[PDB]
Amino acid sequence: GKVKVGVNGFGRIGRLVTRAAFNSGKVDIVAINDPFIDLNYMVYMFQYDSTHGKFHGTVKAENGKLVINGNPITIFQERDPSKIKWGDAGAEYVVESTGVFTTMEKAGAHLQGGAKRVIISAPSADAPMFVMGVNHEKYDNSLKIISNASCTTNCLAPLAKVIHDNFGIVEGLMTTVHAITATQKTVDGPSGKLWRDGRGALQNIIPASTGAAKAVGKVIPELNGKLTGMAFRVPTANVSVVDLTCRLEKPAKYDDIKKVVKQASEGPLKGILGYTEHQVVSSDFNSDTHSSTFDAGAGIALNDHFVKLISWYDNEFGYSNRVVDLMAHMASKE
Amino acid sequence: GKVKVGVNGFGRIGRLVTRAAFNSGKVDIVAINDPFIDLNYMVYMFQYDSTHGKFHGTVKAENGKLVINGNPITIFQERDPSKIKWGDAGAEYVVESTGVFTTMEKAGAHLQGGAKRVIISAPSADAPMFVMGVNHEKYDNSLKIISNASCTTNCLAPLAKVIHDNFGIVEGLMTTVHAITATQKTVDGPSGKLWRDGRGALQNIIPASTGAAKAVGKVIPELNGKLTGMAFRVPTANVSVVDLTCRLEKPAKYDDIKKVVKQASEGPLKGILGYTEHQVVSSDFNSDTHSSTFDAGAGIALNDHFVKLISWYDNEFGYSNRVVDLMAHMASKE
Amino acid sequence: GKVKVGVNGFGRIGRLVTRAAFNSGKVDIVAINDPFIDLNYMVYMFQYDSTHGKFHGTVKAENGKLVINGNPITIFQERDPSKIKWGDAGAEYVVESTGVFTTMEKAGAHLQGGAKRVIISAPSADAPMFVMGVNHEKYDNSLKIISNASCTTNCLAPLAKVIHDNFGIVEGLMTTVHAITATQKTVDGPSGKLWRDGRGALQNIIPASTGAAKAVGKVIPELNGKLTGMAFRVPTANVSVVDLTCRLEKPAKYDDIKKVVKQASEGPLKGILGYTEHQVVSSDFNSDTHSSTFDAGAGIALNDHFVKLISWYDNEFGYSNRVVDLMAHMASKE
Amino acid sequence: GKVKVGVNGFGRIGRLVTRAAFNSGKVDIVAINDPFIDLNYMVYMFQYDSTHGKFHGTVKAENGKLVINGNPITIFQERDPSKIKWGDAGAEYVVESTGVFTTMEKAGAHLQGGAKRVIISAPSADAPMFVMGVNHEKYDNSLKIISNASCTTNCLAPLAKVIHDNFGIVEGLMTTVHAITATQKTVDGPSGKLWRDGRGALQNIIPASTGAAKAVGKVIPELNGKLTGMAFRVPTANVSVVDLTCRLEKPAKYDDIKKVVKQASEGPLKGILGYTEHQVVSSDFNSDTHSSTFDAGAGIALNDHFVKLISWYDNEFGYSNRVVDLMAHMASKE
């Protein structure tokens, strides 16, 4: 019943997606492709994680196949995506997580190998974007290549949708305090395009830009041209926070905002948007599957039309779980 | 000619103030009071600094007096401020930096010891607030107890003043990414009032509140009731950044904002407000004496009436240098 | 059947001991004493942990009692240990974890309250020391006040015992790379006795001394006067590593050492001393209950009589689990 | 009079070598080669440093030449070392700091371009090794390709030489607590050979091996086959520490060791080996030009024949200054 999924690239996103798929069980992984990691290294990388701890289960290599919880997984080492025999392994959906094939033309090479549909775990210039709980009902099954946007967009979209539906956002600017990523340098190093990104990650705030706020307009058409922002990269490990400053049409006291956010988090957006009133910190959301958790006590309102909202999100676990959920919904809609 | 200054408390602020006074030479330190630090420990603490490096000069203890660059300094160990013989040591001005005597009544005990005026290096509930380059011309010499506000207020005030003068701020919300301070815990520890502040500083974002934006209204009367914000405490070492989101009356393209900020930084606010167009990071402002440096490339504008401005500031060196400058101006006005 | 245990002090060690007792179920906690933490703060502190994550269970306050997994716990706020009514709450054993009552006379005040035996979770000047798996068979039930030494001693004792039994250690020097603790300063701060310990923990190696190696001689009488060492405090979070350099009597190739260590870890010291041959790092031992894990690949041997052995240990979870195990063994011996 | 020096590669070592050469003035840099950094990026990278602060001087680009303090510097972008026109730029000595041409045959390609001698800033399999203050008198001018070993070897060699000369080391094992380097990963990443080195540098101790102790035997022939050790990589920034455990022939109390080390540091090894008795930490040696500083208070001695010695060293500034000093001595010997 569950759809067969193949993963391209065994980086951070690919490993986390495999972990989420095996933890939730909504889909079955049957093939992985990576031209620079061998089988034993794959076992070592999957077994041990610095951020999320040891894998809860059994992983081993046998007969040239990665066996996780007794499920053999075919391993490929092709560099050209058009040469990967996805159909032979039985994979129906393919997750493109390498981060280098983001356009529709580049990502469509996987279709030649026998895959039916391709999901891009990154923003795409021309592929359609879907965010779970916001516009995933727009999927009609006639699209072969889509996109899951990014972690920041997935965190910002549900809260922005609720706020716009209840009070009518007029314009907003977003600032996100982000954790370090794999593109940063351990010590001040060489950067070709972004000079700031080449500086030492352990001792530099390194202010950075981001197009997630713009992409929210793509996900929600009514908010097109009304959002934008930047980002800061602090020397933390896993958890990021989003800060949204927006102007509302209708008057909205902070208690009303809290009530509507809690109501949305309970019924319609259960498991996607969280709500908390405790004195939480960043480490309290490690390995949390929510796309975004609204922090009631951290926000502040200048008046009835000018507020600042704070939302937490795990940029590793939440995005992978959202990718798995999107694949499951796509399989159900088939 | 230079006024004689006595320092109460040898914490971070007191040590940095002494260092700034000896580096610039605008004032002379002639007495220090601390009931928990002895002479040899004082020499050790002043000589070595983890953030700003070794002191450039000579410091030693002789005859029960701290000698810095050949200048003897009287040392007191009184716990009650009313019992300190400030007049005997020749100190005219006293810097109250312990952080526990912030009200006018509590801080006035130093006057009984023979001091002429008292400067509080922290926000005060009832003492007048002065920020160098913003409203320091309002000092009239008839005030015996004043205040220098805080680092965040000193960073926000000049940029806000320039923006209000040129374009008429209507309302703004501020977010500051702050470095760790002495009030935080090395590991998750016990906190009586602020539960979030008791969590581990090395692994927690610990969102925190701040009244610096409100205090800007006190410093600039026209902006009363139009500013507010919060703060985030990231596990960095020394440098903080301020993010201001505001709505303007007159239309203002980003180039016009940059031009006016540069013009202000050059002539009127020279040495107080900086300007840069390079790809700088947080560590590039270590040991910088400016109150705030405008980052042209980091900001973003949604439209002609909604912008986000970014300013850097060293929360240790800049505040101490501002305190020294305020004391020098007070002495000149005498 | 399980003995009733009362905990004095709700610091890091006390909270971790309560967590270990509720996770393993070998003993039952029925009373906690802390004069500076109220009930709601206790619930907040127990529920959330930055290092070990959220508590797996339910914790709440009701009728002035802390309820964990449905088990009510009496709460005391006495400051004088002699005034705590341990007998009224039904507590038989008391764990003294405040770190200020370490002598037999000071720790014996708990006996006046009705407690039968007292266990000190820290080194004691005169109380007997017991390490699980090394000399815990020497407990004879006639002792009312004992000690569990420390984390470093608990890590060093089993490996040293095995090495001495198999090859006859002649003399050794130990170096431990330790994680930051609650006694360190978030930023360079004031230290009364240890000047080095007052420096900034996030940016300083802060070399420190330690008497754990000496205490190993107390635990193992044959090694008296043959061990000693120092420590380094690096800006990590939870996991520490011990490095032992020793000279052996009998010739011992590295393979023989590995074989004997593995054999000891399997049968006799199961669950106390671990063994691994993988390429592990410090974060791979987070929340590990072993007292020490031997790292086969990290060690090196100059010749047949001069070797360096490496052992990992979680200084928070392992010590608490050892305390619980010692209490269970004491109850069994009753 | 000063020799003309050309630098191959503008990495960390090359930039630090250029900075040291311009700060001390013992040599003149007249050419730099890097195929992946352009002129403007070179100016940006040289001007700003996260660890050592802003460059004290003026650096700018004009007419395709890097101008530092008014001295133009020719810039090359060749990838093949044999095609670099070292002779045209007037460079006599060439510093090979890329880390990929370490053998004599590979490093000799620079001779075809017109260079007279080549200095390798890294360990070499077959090139002769020289350490300033230990065996640099063995240079006879007939060698065209040599080596400066490494930072760890440069720290260990002088102290080991003094100890062997005064007391006769029999055998020793070394452990070094090292800071993070450019070869580490910002977050757990892919490592081809060293699996441990691919783990997250900000949250992992990552135990590592090192051949510096072995190379000490090459530098000091009498100690061949008597030294070896390993290393630990902690999440610090710049400063490392060396721990040496050795057995001595003659009896040696700790006071005698301190006296001999101080005497050596004063006269013969002035500026190479330091001596301190203060309560220093790692950050106190930032931007220190000494090869190694002996920490009197941190060491410990079990008996008269078994001691542990502690030495600090800046692995960035000290090595670069030693390279400059070696080049100056080579020029003088010409």
Numbering used by the authors:
A (entry chain C), B (entry chain A), C (entry chain B), D (entry chain D): 2 to 335
Relevant lines from the article:
GAPDH is a critical enzyme in the glycolysis pathway, and it mainly localizes in the cytoplasm. Malfunction of GAPDH lowers cellular energy generation and triggers cell death. GAPDH function is highly sensitive to the redox environment within the cell. Prolonged oxidative stress oxidizes GAPDH, which is subsequently translocated into the nucleus and initiates apoptosis.
We applied oxidative stress to genome-edited HEK293T cells and purified endogenous GAPDH from cytosol and nucleus separately after 8 and 24 h of oxidative stress. We further determined structures of cytosolic and nuclear GAPDH from oxidatively stressed cells. Interestingly, by analyzing structure of individual subunits from all GAPDH datasets, including the one without oxidative stress, we captured different conformations of the GAPDH catalytic site. In one conformation, there is a density connecting side chains of C152 and H179. Considering that this is the only conformation of the catalytic site we found in GAPDH without oxidative stress, we name it as the active subunit. In another conformation, which we only found in oxidatively damaged GAPDH, H179 is no longer connected to C152 but instead connected to N316 through a weak density and C152 has a bulky side chain density, as observed in oxidized cysteine found in other studies. Thus, this conformation likely represents the oxidatively damaged catalytic triad, in which oxidized C152 is no longer hydrogen bond with H179. We name this conformation as inactive subunit. By counting the numbers of two types of subunits in all structures, we observed an increase of catalytically inactive subunits in both cytoplasmic and nuclear GAPDH upon prolonged oxidative stress. In the cytoplasm, the fraction of GAPDH containing one inactive subunit increases from zero to ~10% after 8 h and ~20% after 24 h.
